[PDB]
Amino acid sequence: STHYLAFPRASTITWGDDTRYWSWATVDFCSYAIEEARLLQVSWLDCRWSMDASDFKQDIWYNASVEVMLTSNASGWNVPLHLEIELPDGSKQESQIVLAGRQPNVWFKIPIGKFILRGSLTSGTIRFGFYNHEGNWKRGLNIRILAIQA
């Protein structure tokens, strides 16, 4: 079950405030006003949420997903989208996904990994994010939410 939803306004997105690269769209999310971060085009793709370990309970496996949609004009997804969870002790969950060829205009949830807080791992920033920093142009990915489940 879902403990937190973090919408993209809570994240730090490189170029996120520059309308050449990113747009923001207000939509309803089951009675809540949310803003989708809608990627027009960017080369330095980087979206990071930061939540403190103290936000979570100990000795419980949490899994995180990012819910996204490819637009009809999506391109540049032949390069891997890197998925990362970084814990405050240094450990990273690292994985990747190649989005090229996936059906556009359908919401899908990308799992970005799992963590557990044990012992005196009580506090410190946890980073949840996705990035691709290659010189190619990523286009047409809309971001709905980070979900953290246990």
Ligand X SMILES: CC(=O)N[C@@H]1[C@@H](O)[C@H](O[C@@H]2O[C@H](CO)[C@H](O)[C@H](O)[C@H]2O)[C@@H](CO)O[C@@H]1O
Q: Report whether 17 contacts 44 (CB < 8 A).
A: no
Question: Could you tell which of ligand X, a second copy, none binds residue 89, using a CB distance below 5 to 8 A set by kind?
Answer: none
Nearer to a second copy, 37 or 81 (CB): 37
Closest by CA position to 128, among listed 21, 4, 39, 38: 4
Q: Is 3 in the site for a second copy (CB under 8 A)?
A: yes
Which residue in 18, 55, 89, 94 binds a second copy (CB under 8 A)?
A: 55
Q: Which stretches of 53-138 are assigned E, i.e. beta strand?
A: 62-75, 81-86, 92-97, 108-115, 125-132
Rounded to a whole number of angstroms, the minimum distance from the CB of residue 33 to a second copy is 5
Q: Is 15 in the site for ligand X (CB under 6 A)?
A: yes
- For residue 54, CA distances in Å to 88, 117, 127 come to 11, 9, 13
Which residue in 23, 43, 63, 71 binds ligand X (CB under 6 A)?
A: 43
Q: Is 42 in the site for ligand X (CB under 6 A)?
A: yes
Question: Could you tell which of a second copy, ligand X, none binds residue 21, using a CB distance below 5 to 8 A set by kind?
Answer: ligand X
Query: Interface with ligand X by CB under 6 A: which residues?
Result: 14-15, 21, 42-44
